[PDB]
């Protein structure tokens, strides 16, 4: 049973390996993601779709400006 369980969890193992590999990228981008999430939470309740898109482009380019 243990051998069958080990052999039957290759997909779970490679998914866990992929998540551990992508943990570096998620931790690198955590602060920016929190910034932009709070920006949506407190700045976009009263804006239209095209205004939201334009302000999102402005925010993205200005956040990439500061590296």
């Amino acid at each position: 049973r243990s051998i069958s369980l080990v052999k039957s969890l290759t997909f779970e193992k490679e998914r866990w390996l992929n998540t551990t590999k992508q943990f570096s990228k998620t931790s690198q981008e955590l602060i920016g993601n929190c910034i932009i999430s709070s920006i949506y939470e407190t700045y976009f309740g009263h804006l239209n779709e095209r205004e939201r898109g334009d302000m999102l482009v402005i925010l993205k380019r200005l956040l990439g400006k500061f590296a």
Binding site: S2, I3, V6, L9, K13
Partner: peptide
Amino acid sequence: LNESVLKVNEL
């Protein structure tokens, strides 16, 4: 999981 695999390989 790695510890279980190592134990299975050793035995």
